[PDB]
Amino acid sequence: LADSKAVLNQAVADLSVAHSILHQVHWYMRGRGFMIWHPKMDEYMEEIDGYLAEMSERLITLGGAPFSTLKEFSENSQLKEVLGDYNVTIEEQLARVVEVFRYLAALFQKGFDVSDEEGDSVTNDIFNVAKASIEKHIWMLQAELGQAPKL
């Protein structure tokens, strides 16, 4: 992951698995707070989809070839998936979302660094904008869980 194209493709894989994890959280959620957090997962999925559009389009624009099959996403992503379980508590589900978002914020920092080293300023801006928004979500999720952001 030492060129802009490679880190954008890593993000295509990781955002695709993150979307799948968010969807599991949305579907399997139970507990007090469901009525606010279940639809919130749809907002986060739309957010992730937007990152995926910006980063995939930029990769194509640069002459790359985005991963575009579930096998590629699953094999390249560093995120791990588990079977859905309704008995996970809402506190646990929100903590899972924070863990996913911390990973994405770290990936986006890597993308920011790789693109800055290569002078790809457009790609650098894409990762900076996505990092800003995801870190704001981490502050809010952590605040609901009674915690500091701990970036």
Q: In whole angstroms, what is the distance from residue 103 CA to residue 83 CA?
A: 20
Tokens of 150: 């701990």
SS3 call for 115:
helix
Q: Which of 14-22, 33-41, 42-50, 142-150 is the region at the interface with Ca ion (rule: CB under 5 A)?
A: 142-150
Question: In whole angstroms, how close is the CB of 29 to its own copies at the nearest point?
Answer: 6
Query: With binding defined as CB under 5 A, does residue 121 bind Cl ion?
Result: no
Residue by residue, DSSP assigns 84-114 as --TTS-HHHHHHHHHHHHHHHHHHHHHHHHH
**Residues with Cβ within 8 Å of residue 83, at least 6 apart in sequence:** none
Q: In whole angstroms, what is the distance from residue 121 CA to residue 62 CA?
A: 12
Q: Which of 90, 114, 126, 130 binds Cl ion (CB under 5 A)?
A: 90
Query: With binding defined as CB under 5 A, does residue 59 bind Cl ion?
Result: no
Q: In whole angstroms, what is the distance from residue 17 CA to residue 19 CA?
A: 5
Q: Which of 10, 24, 48, 93 binds its own copies (CB under 8 A)?
A: 24
Residues numbered 53 to 82 that lie near its own copies (CB under 8 A) are 56-58, 60-63, 65-74, 81-82
Q: Which of 17-25, 47-55, 85-93, 107-115 is the region at the interface with Cl ion (rule: CB under 5 A)?
A: 85-93
Q: Which of 35, 63, 146, 148 binds Ca ion (CB under 5 A)?
A: 146
Question: In whole angstroms, how close is the CB of 31 to Ca ion at the nearest point?
Answer: 5
